Symmetry: C5
């Protein structure tokens, strides 16, 4: 019983993180109104993609649960 309740809450926080990640993307998007800035934003886009995969992973793990 406790496995399902803990699991449900876990997936919930994840979504909130993803949504918190989208606010950053908006700032990244809006912030794109020089080489350093461009290189940094790419890194930020790379980090965000990584966050995307981390979330998919948790979903894959949940499937097994």
């Amino acid at each position: 019983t406790r496995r399902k309740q803990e699991m449900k809450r876990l997936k919930y926080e994840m979504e909130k993180i993803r949504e918190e990640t989208e606010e950053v993307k908006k700032e990244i998007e809006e912030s794109k109104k020089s080489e350093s800035a461009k290189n940094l934003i790419l890194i930020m886009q790379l980090l965000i993609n990584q966050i995307r995969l981390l979330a998919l992973q948790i979903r894959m793990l949940a499937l097994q649960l």
Copy 2:
């Protein structure tokens, strides 16, 4: 049986402690962003936001495995 669960409980605390330290830094980062910063410091803060978000995902992932090992 119990030893297997014990190590799983110890490792869970090592995460929880890490989650704490990370959440505190987030607060300090939030306090840095209100006080306007340099154009470079801004991007560095935004990157820190993402890395923090990854830490938290990774903490969720450790709770996931711990469930699966529970059963």
Copy 3:
């Protein structure tokens, strides 16, 4: 259950296959940037990017594995 899990699994792998393609385009932009001449700092940025890309790939592999651990 069986058909919903599969689809949810399929969309996970599918949506994953898009993120990998996105990272590849950035890899080509950076490698053109890697060719052009840039300061020591910018070069190190490029290097840092290349590491990020490589460790995206390993997360992708991890998902592919989990999928197969689910499929089999």
Copy 4:
């Protein structure tokens, strides 16, 4: 065979990251620019990640073992 290699390779990683952690603390003992401190934060966040991946590995080991 695989376990020891995995553990040995991991325990080895714990050392190479400690080599990085020492430099940070030595850095922090030296006077820095504001820009530096932001990087030191990033390296601290990065190390936190490494700490967590390491705990995941033990979790995975815990499972497969039994």
Copy 5:
């Protein structure tokens, strides 16, 4: 059968990844051979952390395979 073709891709896929990180590692060592600003030294320490993270993921994959 198909899962076997996937392992073929996955084993190769990795070692291609392991070669590229080595390529970055080669640039870090040659980087360190020249005088470096305080910032770029912190950059290097960062990418060394990233390389470590790559090591850990590969182990997870290996352990997920076992």
